[PDB]
Amino acid sequence: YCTLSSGFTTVDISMAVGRVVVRPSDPVGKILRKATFPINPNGSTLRCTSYSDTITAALTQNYPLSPLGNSIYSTNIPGIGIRLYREAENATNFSGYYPYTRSLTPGTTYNLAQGYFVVEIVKTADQTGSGTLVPGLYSRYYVNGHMDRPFLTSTVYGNAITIASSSHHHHHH
């Protein structure tokens, strides 16, 4: 089982990007935007007693996997997928895509590493929509017994991620 430092505090990442244009000429699979957000740890730590204790990088939107698989999940916008993970500086220490669960090592004091939370916005179908990604919690990174106090969450606030399909612009030739 795992114990948390006194005053353990989740770090929340505000997922936000400038308006993402997606065009008919973009291929399915296009990384329309990879956006990074600094993870600034706050000193929270935890320590566990068993190799059966785990950390989980979980997705929370409960949207179906997109037709592209590879951890690209559908969103509320047609033809637009979202994929989440973490990195350190210079794209090192790739976490692997959310979701995953791994066992921890007993006795090790864990802290959140300085680095980056990553949002990828992906074209998942030929026909793409426009509009505002649905707000709310998108991920939590937590140890067993403490899903209610994650190390790290990521959340969309309000209209922070918008998609513009250029076909919808009705360009006057």
Distances (CA, A) of 47 to 42, 51, 107, 166, 168: 16, 11, 6, 49, 51
* Residue ranges of domains in the chain: 1-173
Phi, psi angles (nearest 5°) of residue 99: -100, 155
For residue 5, the SS3 value is: coil
Residues 117, 84: contact at Cβ < 8 Å? yes
Residues 149, 4: contact at Cβ < 8 Å? yes
What resolution does the deposited structure have, in angstroms?
A: 1.3
Name the one residue in this structure whose structure tokens are 């929370």.
60
Q: Who's near 51: CB < 8 A, 6+ residues apart?
A: 103, 104, 105, 106
The token pair that represents 89 in the structure block: 């500086």
Q: What is the Cα–Cα distance from 163 to 127, expressed in whole angstroms?
A: 13
Name the one residue in this structure whose structure tokens are 């990442």.
13
CA 151 centroid distance within chain: 14
- Solving technique for this entry? X-ray
Residues 150, 9: contact at Cβ < 8 Å? no
Nearest CA to 11 out of 106, 135, 111, 157 is that of: 111
